[PDB]
Fold:
Amino acid sequence: VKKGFRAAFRFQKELERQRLLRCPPPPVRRSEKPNWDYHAEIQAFGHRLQENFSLDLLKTAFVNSCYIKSEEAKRQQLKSNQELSEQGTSFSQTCLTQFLEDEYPDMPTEGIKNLVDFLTGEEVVCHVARNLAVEQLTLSEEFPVPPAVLQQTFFAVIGALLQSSGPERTALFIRDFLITQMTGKELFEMWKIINPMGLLVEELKKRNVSAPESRLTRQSGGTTALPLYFVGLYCDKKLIAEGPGETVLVAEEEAARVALRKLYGFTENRRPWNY
Amino acid sequence: ISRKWEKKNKIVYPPQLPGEPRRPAEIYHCRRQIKYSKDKMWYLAKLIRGMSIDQALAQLEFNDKKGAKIIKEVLLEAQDMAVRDHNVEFRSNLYIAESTSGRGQCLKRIRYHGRGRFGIMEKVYCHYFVKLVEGPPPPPEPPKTAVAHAKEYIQQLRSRTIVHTL
Amino acid sequence: SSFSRAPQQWATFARIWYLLDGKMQPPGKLAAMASIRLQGLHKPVYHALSDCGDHVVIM
Amino acid sequence: TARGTPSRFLASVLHNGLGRYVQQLQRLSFSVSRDGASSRGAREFVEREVIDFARRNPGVVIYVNSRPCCVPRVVAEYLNGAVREESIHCKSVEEISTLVQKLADQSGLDVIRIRKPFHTDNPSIQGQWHPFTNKPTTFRGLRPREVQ
Amino acid sequence: IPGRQWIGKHRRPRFVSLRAKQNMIRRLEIEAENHYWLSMPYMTREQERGHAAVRRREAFEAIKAAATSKFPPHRFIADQLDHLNVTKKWS
Amino acid sequence: TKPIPREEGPMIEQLSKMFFTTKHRWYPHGRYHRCRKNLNPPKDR
Amino acid sequence: LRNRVTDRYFRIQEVLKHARHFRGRKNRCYRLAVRTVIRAFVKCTKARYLKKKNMRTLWINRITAASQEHGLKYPALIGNLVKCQVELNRKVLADLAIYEPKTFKSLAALASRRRHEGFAAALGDGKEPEGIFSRVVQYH
RNA sequence: ACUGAACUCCUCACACCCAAUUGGACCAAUCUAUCACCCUAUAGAAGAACUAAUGUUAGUAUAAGUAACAUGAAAACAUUCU
Ligand SMILES: [Mg+2]
Ligand SMILES: [Mg+2]
Ligand SMILES: [Mg+2]
Ligand SMILES: [Mg+2]
Ligand SMILES: [Mg+2]
Ligand SMILES: [Mg+2]
Ligand SMILES: [Mg+2]
Ligand SMILES: [Mg+2]
Ligand SMILES: [Mg+2]
Ligand SMILES: [Mg+2]
Ligand SMILES: [Mg+2]
Ligand SMILES: [Mg+2]
Ligand SMILES: [Mg+2]
Ligand SMILES: [Mg+2]
Structure:
């Protein structure tokens, strides 16, 4: 028994750290932990993003309905969220179609509607709000916050900033957080499609161009388990695209995808977003 | 001495919901201070690690080693406490999920060698640990075919990147 | 350009069968070219751990 | 070393520079003992510098706790949920201004090894190399020792 | 080779490649240009005499004076009293 | 352009002959090498 | 013992945390782990020079390969890009060789153009008009 | 001509590659004085730091489940036989 206190204390804390990393505690929300001031942290949310709100209206922007229901059920023993989220999702859809219809005029409206269904989808919006400290400020029932609730609070913050500082500062807000989520992403990783060849044929009929010949340009390893093909797509003996594939069908459909990117201005080499 | 394996039949779970699959039972039984060595018990413990308990009883009634009778005592005792104490309805519906064997507290005796020199014999003791799980035994892992190896090689070829550049 | 991820990646690293006639040729000067095209040292995507060699048929 | 430590790629949080720059540091949490030589330069930091720091960036909310601690800490919490707890034990006021400004300047990414010093997401503009760049085609797409 | 390649009676041979010849040659050319520029002094030995005796004298007065000005540093009250703030408290 | 056209031993010889690689990368590796592999590697780009 | 050491577990754990991925008893026993962890740190510092070296020889392999695609060799390409005052380094030229091969083809045509101006320049000795890409930009 | 170093240049930072020896700045833990109070501070002291003595004591490995060891036979376990 070695006399002392300090090695027993440090080893007591490392036994505490191994008890944590063995049985990790369930995630408790941030409001139920020390060093929390909800008003100072709403104000910090305002100054953090570099805009001004009307702070009581942002307080209503973070309050859900399921929290109001469970709060009334805890009263047995506040304005809801729906309006600001409705204004924010209407305005956010209209600004995303304005930005996309302006910066991609050759796109079809189906593809722009699916791009806004990507940029306002739950994966993107729930990825943005968990890194803008929205999830910590949402007053909700269950924890961790379900995705449709957190999407509803995110567009509640957008509609709240619409009522705070008008349409144009919210247009810059959506410009700087929702649009920058499509940087580096493929068109057909956002607007996922099936059978690009038939869609490419209809797009050539809308430009009144004759139907394309799918036409093998270069190949390698045709009789092995690792082939490589470059199928081109010619249109009156002039190619629109050419793509590789492990088989011939894969290279043909993927050359149809490259042709669809070049028809829409959504190439890999397009002029980037201007900020 | 630590005796943490007797405690594992005491962990009580909260009652389930209607929207939840039925949990298989788990039955922890062990014998302490078996006079046998810990790595002669590894072969008999290893033999039965995925078999059902009726198959394992069949394999241990007919093995010549000393530990087979003792493991059959442990498995019969864990089948009885399986039915009585642990709410396992079918006796046959049990497979050995874990059968290990640690070392016990041994003894030290003197073995006399050919001169004044000698050696220190150990009287070797061991334990024997068992977790039975209610249910059919899991299927043995099928050996991966040329389809699985071909997809693994091609998935590695698809995985690779131009390295040490942008 | 403007491919997807996996077809671009398949296109960059796919290996090319070469043919190489060796009539009246010295075997070491064929062995230099065959060696370079077997290691992938004729590709600027060359790395020793990327497995980017090719096939060489010498007739 | 680098093979015992994990590694990562050089990234940002939500494309932190493109549209606007967002301060990645949410909360600082000072815990400073009232009587104790360990938290002396922390106390002189609260008396002098934490107010001017708190005004130089209002997106950070600061919690000075002032409990009987035996080692003072500062706990930086970042927008992505990362929490870096560093000790200001027996550090002077200038060293706590550089330490707190260091925590303010950085982000909630790990301080593990970064593999590449750069991160393009569109690395190729003229089209990436494949082995059929720099190879001329032949007539009718013919391969060697092919007659027809 | 008989033993220890590079020292001894029977050493292994080493031969002068074209690298080593061109290296030695360009060293000889740099050397010969050094032989050119050392062949024309701007002064004779009479003319240089004493032209920097003043500056050398003042330089050694600086080194001598830096040597003879070495002494313990000043000791202040504010450092010793400044130690007392190790038990500075709040209230 | 051309128009578009319209047991462990034997298995390791068949895969080696199939993908033109040697036999050694088809024999497995033990638990120590299956459990040093970084199963969640960093993605980029 | 008046004062014997209490904090000794943490010194062992200072060394052994770097050994957690070794083989054998090097990950476990302190006597073996000190030698292999010291030795791993010495290799870790001597491998920074080898990181720089192996990156540079890897770039010369990539520039060599992609310049063999355009008919040039490596020393003609590098010497004749130096002689145009286009002072791109090896890392950039390997990255253009991979990601932007039109630019690398135009650098290959600029370097081979300058190489032929050097051949025709040293061929017709005496005073002749200089090459067009053979002119140098004088800074002052 | 190219390649080619820890030389030299370059961006930032600099007290940060020798034996025996010698000079200096710090310092783990312990106790004492006084603060402190989830483990500390300024001092004062000392059985004050171990990858090495065919080191000592204890534990457990390896060699190795190896070398070695032990019960004449049938039966009713009364007995008989060799
Ligand atoms: Mg023993
Ligand atoms: Mg010799
Ligand atoms: Mg160099
Ligand atoms: Mg130097
Ligand atoms: Mg220096
Ligand atoms: Mg002390
Ligand atoms: Mg001692
Ligand atoms: Mg020891
Ligand atoms: Mg020693
Ligand atoms: Mg010893
Ligand atoms: Mg053994
Ligand atoms: Mg035996
Ligand atoms: Mg043996
Ligand atoms: Mg024997």
Observations:
- The longest strand of chain C covers residues 17-20.
- Chains C and E do not touch (no CB pair under 8 Å).
